[PDB]
Amino acid sequence: QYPIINFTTAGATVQSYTNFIRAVRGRLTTGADVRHEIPVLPNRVGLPINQRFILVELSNHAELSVTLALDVTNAYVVGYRAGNSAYFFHPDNQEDAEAITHLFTDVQNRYTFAFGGNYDRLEQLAGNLRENIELGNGPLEEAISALYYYSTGGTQLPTLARSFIICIQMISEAARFQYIEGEMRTRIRYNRRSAPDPSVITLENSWGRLSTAIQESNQGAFASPIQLQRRNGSKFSVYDVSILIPIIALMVYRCAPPP
């Protein structure tokens, strides 16, 4: 039985959301590997299956619940349970395929989607880009109802897909980036929904390369700058880990730390 973190969108506040994201980060990171002050997720090679996943149970105002499964090695949502069913994104390799058989083993109906959980795929299934999909407490409340009603046949795949896109950003991307967590906190604080601005999208698209650049840096200095975007869409270059310390909360393992 993997660790479970609970969050309800009903009556959510900045504080309850922050506590939630902080608990998710705390279960993702064994805290073993920090580099330039940024924790790195556990290396997949050698991590025991019994420690591979965490469970995120989400409940809403309609009193419905779904439970997402996150891979601790990269904070990826690999599937979810609703009622007496579990559903998984198509696995990226036999290793991962094997790992997931350990999830939601007590459910009656397990389906593995033929599609993976990548954004491009979800955006196609949803018929919309991330920049056109609103994020916030309302959208997350509705996403939970949509995931739940899929198990009963009342949710179409476009809606299911748009609902994954909302969950993945408000949970996994916010766990990865304090900056995205901050954008979601602001939405909650003013009870507003709005699509993510370019700064959020470009960070999301740059997690792996930021992770590598930091882990391969020379004393924190990048050999090659990485271009990110401001909230207004203009570009700016990152040359050093220092300005990312307040931005990125977790990195994926890309290389062993040097002696």
PDB file of C-alpha atoms in Angstrom:
ATOM      1  CA  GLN A   1       0.000   0.000   0.000  1.00  0.00           C
ATOM      2  CA  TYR A   2       1.598   3.186  -1.213  1.00  0.00           C
ATOM      3  CA  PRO A   3       1.477   6.439   0.717  1.00  0.00           C
ATOM      4  CA  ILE A   4      -1.725   8.411   0.136  1.00  0.00           C
ATOM      5  CA  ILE A   5      -2.120  12.192   0.229  1.00  0.00           C
ATOM      6  CA  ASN A   6      -5.695  13.609   0.322  1.00  0.00           C
ATOM      7  CA  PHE A   7      -6.880  16.920  -1.101  1.00  0.00           C
ATOM      8  CA  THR A   8     -10.359  18.282  -1.526  1.00  0.00           C
ATOM      9  CA  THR A   9     -11.091  21.133  -3.833  1.00  0.00           C
ATOM     10  CA  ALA A  10     -14.241  21.841  -1.869  1.00  0.00           C
ATOM     11  CA  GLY A  11     -13.530  24.992   0.181  1.00  0.00           C
ATOM     12  CA  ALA A  12      -9.843  24.854  -0.812  1.00  0.00           C
ATOM     13  CA  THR A  13      -7.744  27.812   0.317  1.00  0.00           C
ATOM     14  CA  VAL A  14      -4.238  29.004  -0.437  1.00  0.00           C
ATOM     15  CA  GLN A  15      -3.127  27.332   2.754  1.00  0.00           C
ATOM     16  CA  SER A  16      -4.828  23.962   2.214  1.00  0.00           C
ATOM     17  CA  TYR A  17      -3.467  23.798  -1.357  1.00  0.00           C
ATOM     18  CA  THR A  18       0.039  24.783  -0.212  1.00  0.00           C
ATOM     19  CA  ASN A  19      -0.060  22.146   2.548  1.00  0.00           C
ATOM     20  CA  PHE A  20      -1.147  19.615  -0.067  1.00  0.00           C
ATOM     21  CA  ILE A  21       1.642  20.420  -2.527  1.00  0.00           C
ATOM     22  CA  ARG A  22       4.166  20.397   0.313  1.00  0.00           C
ATOM     23  CA  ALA A  23       2.990  16.926   1.388  1.00  0.00           C
ATOM     24  CA  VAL A  24       3.185  15.670  -2.213  1.00  0.00           C
ATOM     25  CA  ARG A  25       6.778  16.995  -2.498  1.00  0.00           C
ATOM     26  CA  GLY A  26       7.608  15.386   0.848  1.00  0.00           C
ATOM     27  CA  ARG A  27       6.487  11.960  -0.360  1.00  0.00           C
ATOM     28  CA  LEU A  28       8.166  12.351  -3.766  1.00  0.00           C
ATOM     29  CA  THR A  29      11.623  13.162  -2.435  1.00  0.00           C
ATOM     30  CA  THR A  30      13.411  10.760  -0.137  1.00  0.00           C
ATOM     31  CA  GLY A  31      15.430  13.949   0.426  1.00  0.00           C
ATOM     32  CA  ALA A  32      18.585  11.932  -0.310  1.00  0.00           C
ATOM     33  CA  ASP A  33      19.883  13.881  -3.288  1.00  0.00           C
ATOM     34  CA  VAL A  34      19.966  17.665  -3.201  1.00  0.00           C
ATOM     35  CA  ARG A  35      22.056  19.598  -5.716  1.00  0.00           C
ATOM     36  CA  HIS A  36      22.566  23.358  -5.707  1.00  0.00           C
ATOM     37  CA  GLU A  37      19.944  23.361  -2.997  1.00  0.00           C
ATOM     38  CA  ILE A  38      17.338  21.759  -5.252  1.00  0.00           C
ATOM     39  CA  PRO A  39      16.161  18.268  -4.339  1.00  0.00           C
ATOM     40  CA  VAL A  40      16.470  15.605  -7.010  1.00  0.00           C
ATOM     41  CA  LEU A  41      13.954  12.827  -7.282  1.00  0.00           C
ATOM     42  CA  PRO A  42      15.177   9.275  -6.572  1.00  0.00           C
ATOM     43  CA  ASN A  43      17.034   7.511  -9.384  1.00  0.00           C
ATOM     44  CA  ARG A  44      14.770   4.990 -11.023  1.00  0.00           C
ATOM     45  CA  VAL A  45      17.561   2.466 -11.530  1.00  0.00           C
ATOM     46  CA  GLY A  46      17.678   0.705  -8.171  1.00  0.00           C
ATOM     47  CA  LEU A  47      14.599   2.178  -6.441  1.00  0.00           C
ATOM     48  CA  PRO A  48      12.517  -0.676  -5.023  1.00  0.00           C
ATOM     49  CA  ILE A  49       9.051  -1.234  -6.462  1.00  0.00           C
ATOM     50  CA  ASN A  50       7.554  -0.934  -2.960  1.00  0.00           C
ATOM     51  CA  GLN A  51       8.639   2.744  -2.998  1.00  0.00           C
ATOM     52  CA  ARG A  52       7.830   3.574  -6.626  1.00  0.00           C
ATOM     53  CA  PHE A  53       4.471   5.363  -6.386  1.00  0.00           C
ATOM     54  CA  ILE A  54       2.471   7.676  -4.277  1.00  0.00           C
ATOM     55  CA  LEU A  55      -1.337   8.028  -4.248  1.00  0.00           C
ATOM     56  CA  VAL A  56      -3.110  11.357  -4.561  1.00  0.00           C
ATOM     57  CA  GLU A  57      -6.773  11.133  -3.608  1.00  0.00           C
ATOM     58  CA  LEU A  58      -8.839  14.097  -4.792  1.00  0.00           C
ATOM     59  CA  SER A  59     -12.366  14.807  -3.565  1.00  0.00           C
ATOM     60  CA  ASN A  60     -14.674  17.583  -4.561  1.00  0.00           C
ATOM     61  CA  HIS A  61     -17.828  19.514  -3.631  1.00  0.00           C
ATOM     62  CA  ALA A  62     -20.005  16.967  -5.471  1.00  0.00           C
ATOM     63  CA  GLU A  63     -18.650  14.451  -2.905  1.00  0.00           C
ATOM     64  CA  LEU A  64     -16.866  12.467  -5.612  1.00  0.00           C
ATOM     65  CA  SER A  65     -13.340  11.042  -5.281  1.00  0.00           C
ATOM     66  CA  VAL A  66     -10.656   9.768  -7.633  1.00  0.00           C
ATOM     67  CA  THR A  67      -7.133   8.619  -6.736  1.00  0.00           C
ATOM     68  CA  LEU A  68      -4.212   9.456  -9.050  1.00  0.00           C
ATOM     69  CA  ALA A  69      -1.032   7.409  -9.098  1.00  0.00           C
ATOM     70  CA  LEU A  70       2.265   9.340  -9.309  1.00  0.00           C
ATOM     71  CA  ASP A  71       5.696   7.836 -10.130  1.00  0.00           C
ATOM     72  CA  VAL A  72       8.161   9.207  -7.582  1.00  0.00           C
ATOM     73  CA  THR A  73      11.067   9.174 -10.072  1.00  0.00           C
ATOM     74  CA  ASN A  74       9.536  11.884 -12.263  1.00  0.00           C
ATOM     75  CA  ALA A  75       6.226  12.960 -10.643  1.00  0.00           C
ATOM     76  CA  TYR A  76       4.381  11.554 -13.663  1.00  0.00           C
ATOM     77  CA  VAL A  77       0.668  10.704 -13.325  1.00  0.00           C
ATOM     78  CA  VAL A  78       0.597   7.159 -14.633  1.00  0.00           C
ATOM     79  CA  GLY A  79      -3.055   6.490 -13.984  1.00  0.00           C
ATOM     80  CA  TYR A  80      -5.928   6.668 -11.561  1.00  0.00           C
ATOM     81  CA  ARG A  81      -8.710   4.791  -9.780  1.00  0.00           C
ATOM     82  CA  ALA A  82     -12.402   5.719  -9.599  1.00  0.00           C
ATOM     83  CA  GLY A  83     -14.865   3.400  -7.901  1.00  0.00           C
ATOM     84  CA  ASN A  84     -14.188  -0.176  -8.889  1.00  0.00           C
ATOM     85  CA  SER A  85     -11.885   0.634 -11.783  1.00  0.00           C
ATOM     86  CA  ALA A  86      -8.325   1.686 -12.459  1.00  0.00           C
ATOM     87  CA  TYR A  87      -6.997   3.227 -15.640  1.00  0.00           C
ATOM     88  CA  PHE A  88      -3.410   3.628 -16.718  1.00  0.00           C
ATOM     89  CA  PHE A  89      -1.663   5.548 -19.477  1.00  0.00           C
ATOM     90  CA  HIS A  90       0.213   3.260 -21.900  1.00  0.00           C
ATOM     91  CA  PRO A  91       3.627   2.490 -20.258  1.00  0.00           C
ATOM     92  CA  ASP A  92       6.835   3.781 -21.856  1.00  0.00           C
ATOM     93  CA  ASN A  93       8.687   0.473 -21.303  1.00  0.00           C
ATOM     94  CA  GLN A  94       8.449  -3.037 -19.896  1.00  0.00           C
ATOM     95  CA  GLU A  95      10.025  -1.866 -16.682  1.00  0.00           C
ATOM     96  CA  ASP A  96       7.238   0.683 -16.130  1.00  0.00           C
ATOM     97  CA  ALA A  97       4.637  -1.767 -17.456  1.00  0.00           C
ATOM     98  CA  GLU A  98       5.766  -4.116 -14.724  1.00  0.00           C
ATOM     99  CA  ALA A  99       5.762  -1.399 -12.066  1.00  0.00           C
ATOM    100  CA  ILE A 100       2.120  -0.493 -12.640  1.00  0.00           C
ATOM    101  CA  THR A 101       0.752  -4.001 -12.058  1.00  0.00           C
ATOM    102  CA  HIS A 102       1.532  -3.137  -8.449  1.00  0.00           C
ATOM    103  CA  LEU A 103      -1.035  -0.330  -8.517  1.00  0.00           C
ATOM    104  CA  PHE A 104      -4.698  -0.510  -7.456  1.00  0.00           C
ATOM    105  CA  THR A 105      -4.499  -4.281  -7.335  1.00  0.00           C
ATOM    106  CA  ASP A 106      -7.841  -4.562  -5.553  1.00  0.00           C
ATOM    107  CA  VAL A 107      -9.885  -2.916  -8.317  1.00  0.00           C
ATOM    108  CA  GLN A 108     -12.134  -5.023 -10.515  1.00  0.00           C
ATOM    109  CA  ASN A 109     -11.737  -3.380 -13.884  1.00  0.00           C
ATOM    110  CA  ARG A 110      -8.287  -2.343 -15.043  1.00  0.00           C
ATOM    111  CA  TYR A 111      -7.828  -0.663 -18.438  1.00  0.00           C
ATOM    112  CA  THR A 112      -4.563   0.532 -19.888  1.00  0.00           C
ATOM    113  CA  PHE A 113      -5.235   3.326 -22.360  1.00  0.00           C
ATOM    114  CA  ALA A 114      -3.590   2.810 -25.764  1.00  0.00           C
ATOM    115  CA  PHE A 115      -2.376   6.387 -25.395  1.00  0.00           C
ATOM    116  CA  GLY A 116       0.374   7.726 -23.164  1.00  0.00           C
ATOM    117  CA  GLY A 117      -0.002  10.671 -20.822  1.00  0.00           C
ATOM    118  CA  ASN A 118       2.178  13.184 -22.695  1.00  0.00           C
ATOM    119  CA  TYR A 119       0.801  16.742 -23.324  1.00  0.00           C
ATOM    120  CA  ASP A 120       0.868  16.624 -27.122  1.00  0.00           C
ATOM    121  CA  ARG A 121      -1.196  13.436 -27.016  1.00  0.00           C
ATOM    122  CA  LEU A 122      -3.632  14.781 -24.417  1.00  0.00           C
ATOM    123  CA  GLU A 123      -4.007  18.104 -26.258  1.00  0.00           C
ATOM    124  CA  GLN A 124      -4.908  16.232 -29.413  1.00  0.00           C
ATOM    125  CA  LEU A 125      -7.401  14.039 -27.596  1.00  0.00           C
ATOM    126  CA  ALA A 126      -8.799  17.179 -25.870  1.00  0.00           C
ATOM    127  CA  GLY A 127      -8.900  19.197 -29.112  1.00  0.00           C
ATOM    128  CA  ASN A 128      -7.181  22.122 -27.360  1.00  0.00           C
ATOM    129  CA  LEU A 129      -3.737  23.445 -26.359  1.00  0.00           C
ATOM    130  CA  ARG A 130      -2.711  24.059 -22.726  1.00  0.00           C
ATOM    131  CA  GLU A 131      -2.881  27.800 -23.359  1.00  0.00           C
ATOM    132  CA  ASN A 132      -6.606  27.430 -24.023  1.00  0.00           C
ATOM    133  CA  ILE A 133      -7.521  25.336 -20.990  1.00  0.00           C
ATOM    134  CA  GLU A 134      -8.386  27.221 -17.764  1.00  0.00           C
ATOM    135  CA  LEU A 135      -6.737  26.205 -14.487  1.00  0.00           C
ATOM    136  CA  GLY A 136      -7.958  26.942 -10.986  1.00  0.00           C
ATOM    137  CA  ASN A 137     -10.077  25.462  -8.266  1.00  0.00           C
ATOM    138  CA  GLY A 138     -13.243  25.415 -10.391  1.00  0.00           C
ATOM    139  CA  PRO A 139     -11.526  23.634 -13.263  1.00  0.00           C
ATOM    140  CA  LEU A 140     -10.017  21.084 -10.840  1.00  0.00           C
ATOM    141  CA  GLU A 141     -13.386  20.458  -9.157  1.00  0.00           C
ATOM    142  CA  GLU A 142     -14.887  19.740 -12.628  1.00  0.00           C
ATOM    143  CA  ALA A 143     -11.919  17.596 -13.650  1.00  0.00           C
ATOM    144  CA  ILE A 144     -12.529  15.379 -10.626  1.00  0.00           C
ATOM    145  CA  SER A 145     -16.196  14.882 -11.590  1.00  0.00           C
ATOM    146  CA  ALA A 146     -15.124  14.117 -15.174  1.00  0.00           C
ATOM    147  CA  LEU A 147     -12.538  11.476 -14.116  1.00  0.00           C
ATOM    148  CA  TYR A 148     -15.085   9.876 -11.816  1.00  0.00           C
ATOM    149  CA  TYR A 149     -17.874   9.756 -14.382  1.00  0.00           C
ATOM    150  CA  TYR A 150     -15.571   8.160 -16.963  1.00  0.00           C
ATOM    151  CA  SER A 151     -15.652   4.987 -14.884  1.00  0.00           C
ATOM    152  CA  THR A 152     -19.460   4.981 -15.281  1.00  0.00           C
ATOM    153  CA  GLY A 153     -19.568   5.862 -18.992  1.00  0.00           C
ATOM    154  CA  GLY A 154     -20.724   9.480 -18.606  1.00  0.00           C
ATOM    155  CA  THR A 155     -17.474  11.200 -19.642  1.00  0.00           C
ATOM    156  CA  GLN A 156     -16.226  11.560 -23.222  1.00  0.00           C
ATOM    157  CA  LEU A 157     -12.497  11.240 -24.010  1.00  0.00           C
ATOM    158  CA  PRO A 158     -11.984  14.880 -24.934  1.00  0.00           C
ATOM    159  CA  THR A 159     -13.317  15.841 -21.530  1.00  0.00           C
ATOM    160  CA  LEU A 160     -11.299  13.109 -19.825  1.00  0.00           C
ATOM    161  CA  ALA A 161      -8.171  14.396 -21.650  1.00  0.00           C
ATOM    162  CA  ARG A 162      -8.758  18.071 -20.742  1.00  0.00           C
ATOM    163  CA  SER A 163      -9.331  16.861 -17.186  1.00  0.00           C
ATOM    164  CA  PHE A 164      -5.945  15.067 -17.094  1.00  0.00           C
ATOM    165  CA  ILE A 165      -4.286  18.212 -18.441  1.00  0.00           C
ATOM    166  CA  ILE A 166      -5.772  20.227 -15.513  1.00  0.00           C
ATOM    167  CA  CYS A 167      -4.776  17.621 -12.896  1.00  0.00           C
ATOM    168  CA  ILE A 168      -1.268  17.173 -14.265  1.00  0.00           C
ATOM    169  CA  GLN A 169      -0.609  20.919 -14.118  1.00  0.00           C
ATOM    170  CA  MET A 170      -2.197  21.651 -10.726  1.00  0.00           C
ATOM    171  CA  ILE A 171      -0.547  18.649  -9.034  1.00  0.00           C
ATOM    172  CA  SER A 172       2.609  17.364 -10.816  1.00  0.00           C
ATOM    173  CA  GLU A 173       3.765  20.692 -12.384  1.00  0.00           C
ATOM    174  CA  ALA A 174       3.048  22.597  -9.194  1.00  0.00           C
ATOM    175  CA  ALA A 175       5.011  19.935  -7.170  1.00  0.00           C
ATOM    176  CA  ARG A 176       7.973  20.379  -9.629  1.00  0.00           C
ATOM    177  CA  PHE A 177       7.936  24.225  -9.722  1.00  0.00           C
ATOM    178  CA  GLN A 178       7.362  26.576  -6.769  1.00  0.00           C
ATOM    179  CA  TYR A 179       6.645  29.125  -9.483  1.00  0.00           C
ATOM    180  CA  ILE A 180       3.720  27.133 -10.901  1.00  0.00           C
ATOM    181  CA  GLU A 181       2.530  26.349  -7.382  1.00  0.00           C
ATOM    182  CA  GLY A 182       2.521  30.142  -6.883  1.00  0.00           C
ATOM    183  CA  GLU A 183       0.427  30.745 -10.040  1.00  0.00           C
ATOM    184  CA  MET A 184      -2.098  28.185  -8.792  1.00  0.00           C
ATOM    185  CA  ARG A 185      -2.124  29.718  -5.333  1.00  0.00           C
ATOM    186  CA  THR A 186      -3.002  33.099  -6.865  1.00  0.00           C
ATOM    187  CA  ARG A 187      -5.936  31.557  -8.780  1.00  0.00           C
ATOM    188  CA  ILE A 188      -7.234  30.032  -5.547  1.00  0.00           C
ATOM    189  CA  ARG A 189      -6.627  33.222  -3.532  1.00  0.00           C
ATOM    190  CA  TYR A 190      -8.862  35.304  -5.848  1.00  0.00           C
ATOM    191  CA  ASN A 191     -11.152  32.380  -6.840  1.00  0.00           C
ATOM    192  CA  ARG A 192     -10.260  32.907 -10.470  1.00  0.00           C
ATOM    193  CA  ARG A 193      -9.634  30.509 -13.327  1.00  0.00           C
ATOM    194  CA  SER A 194      -7.486  31.301 -16.316  1.00  0.00           C
ATOM    195  CA  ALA A 195      -5.320  29.475 -18.802  1.00  0.00           C
ATOM    196  CA  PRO A 196      -1.589  29.275 -18.055  1.00  0.00           C
ATOM    197  CA  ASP A 197       0.544  32.184 -19.412  1.00  0.00           C
ATOM    198  CA  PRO A 198       3.664  31.538 -21.556  1.00  0.00           C
ATOM    199  CA  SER A 199       5.962  31.534 -18.495  1.00  0.00           C
ATOM    200  CA  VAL A 200       4.113  28.507 -17.099  1.00  0.00           C
ATOM    201  CA  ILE A 201       3.992  26.621 -20.418  1.00  0.00           C
ATOM    202  CA  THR A 202       7.689  27.155 -21.174  1.00  0.00           C
ATOM    203  CA  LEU A 203       8.717  26.038 -17.662  1.00  0.00           C
ATOM    204  CA  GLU A 204       6.581  22.899 -18.043  1.00  0.00           C
ATOM    205  CA  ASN A 205       8.224  22.202 -21.426  1.00  0.00           C
ATOM    206  CA  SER A 206      11.709  22.790 -19.967  1.00  0.00           C
ATOM    207  CA  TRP A 207      11.763  20.662 -16.783  1.00  0.00           C
ATOM    208  CA  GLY A 208      14.043  17.923 -18.148  1.00  0.00           C
ATOM    209  CA  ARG A 209      16.472  20.278 -19.805  1.00  0.00           C
ATOM    210  CA  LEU A 210      16.604  22.582 -16.739  1.00  0.00           C
ATOM    211  CA  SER A 211      17.257  19.483 -14.649  1.00  0.00           C
ATOM    212  CA  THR A 212      20.136  18.397 -16.884  1.00  0.00           C
ATOM    213  CA  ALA A 213      21.616  21.857 -17.142  1.00  0.00           C
ATOM    214  CA  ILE A 214      21.707  22.216 -13.375  1.00  0.00           C
ATOM    215  CA  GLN A 215      23.145  18.728 -12.776  1.00  0.00           C
ATOM    216  CA  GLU A 216      25.817  19.199 -15.452  1.00  0.00           C
ATOM    217  CA  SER A 217      26.595  22.834 -14.472  1.00  0.00           C
ATOM    218  CA  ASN A 218      30.084  23.974 -13.592  1.00  0.00           C
ATOM    219  CA  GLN A 219      29.673  25.092  -9.962  1.00  0.00           C
ATOM    220  CA  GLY A 220      26.106  26.234 -10.884  1.00  0.00           C
ATOM    221  CA  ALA A 221      27.090  28.013 -14.154  1.00  0.00           C
ATOM    222  CA  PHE A 222      25.506  26.688 -17.394  1.00  0.00           C
ATOM    223  CA  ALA A 223      27.713  26.090 -20.396  1.00  0.00           C
ATOM    224  CA  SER A 224      24.711  26.857 -22.595  1.00  0.00           C
ATOM    225  CA  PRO A 225      21.969  29.291 -21.557  1.00  0.00           C
ATOM    226  CA  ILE A 226      18.333  28.063 -21.506  1.00  0.00           C
ATOM    227  CA  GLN A 227      15.654  30.326 -22.971  1.00  0.00           C
ATOM    228  CA  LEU A 228      12.514  30.706 -20.869  1.00  0.00           C
ATOM    229  CA  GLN A 229       9.580  33.094 -21.315  1.00  0.00           C
ATOM    230  CA  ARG A 230       8.153  35.899 -19.201  1.00  0.00           C
ATOM    231  CA  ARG A 231       4.463  36.153 -18.452  1.00  0.00           C
ATOM    232  CA  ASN A 232       4.111  38.467 -21.434  1.00  0.00           C
ATOM    233  CA  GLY A 233       5.731  35.967 -23.840  1.00  0.00           C
ATOM    234  CA  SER A 234       9.086  37.736 -24.156  1.00  0.00           C
ATOM    235  CA  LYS A 235      12.202  35.585 -23.852  1.00  0.00           C
ATOM    236  CA  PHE A 236      14.998  35.655 -21.309  1.00  0.00           C
ATOM    237  CA  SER A 237      18.020  33.451 -20.800  1.00  0.00           C
ATOM    238  CA  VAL A 238      19.034  31.522 -17.726  1.00  0.00           C
ATOM    239  CA  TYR A 239      22.833  31.217 -17.288  1.00  0.00           C
ATOM    240  CA  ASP A 240      23.007  29.874 -13.746  1.00  0.00           C
ATOM    241  CA  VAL A 241      21.206  27.751 -11.173  1.00  0.00           C
ATOM    242  CA  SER A 242      20.888  30.736  -8.735  1.00  0.00           C
ATOM    243  CA  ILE A 243      17.840  32.293 -10.339  1.00  0.00           C
ATOM    244  CA  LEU A 244      16.099  28.900 -10.567  1.00  0.00           C
ATOM    245  CA  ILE A 245      16.378  28.125  -6.824  1.00  0.00           C
ATOM    246  CA  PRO A 246      13.112  30.027  -6.136  1.00  0.00           C
ATOM    247  CA  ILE A 247      11.524  28.569  -9.287  1.00  0.00           C
ATOM    248  CA  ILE A 248      12.126  24.821  -9.362  1.00  0.00           C
ATOM    249  CA  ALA A 249      11.268  22.679  -6.358  1.00  0.00           C
ATOM    250  CA  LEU A 250      12.231  19.220  -7.686  1.00  0.00           C
ATOM    251  CA  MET A 251      14.458  17.976 -10.518  1.00  0.00           C
ATOM    252  CA  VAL A 252      14.384  14.647 -12.328  1.00  0.00           C
ATOM    253  CA  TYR A 253      17.520  12.547 -12.110  1.00  0.00           C
ATOM    254  CA  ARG A 254      19.593  13.041 -15.281  1.00  0.00           C
ATOM    255  CA  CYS A 255      23.080  12.204 -14.087  1.00  0.00           C
ATOM    256  CA  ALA A 256      24.832  10.887 -11.011  1.00  0.00           C
ATOM    257  CA  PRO A 257      26.153  13.720  -8.831  1.00  0.00           C
ATOM    258  CA  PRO A 258      29.859  14.286  -9.241  1.00  0.00           C
ATOM    259  CA  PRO A 259      32.103  13.403  -6.327  1.00  0.00           C
TER     260      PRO A 259
END
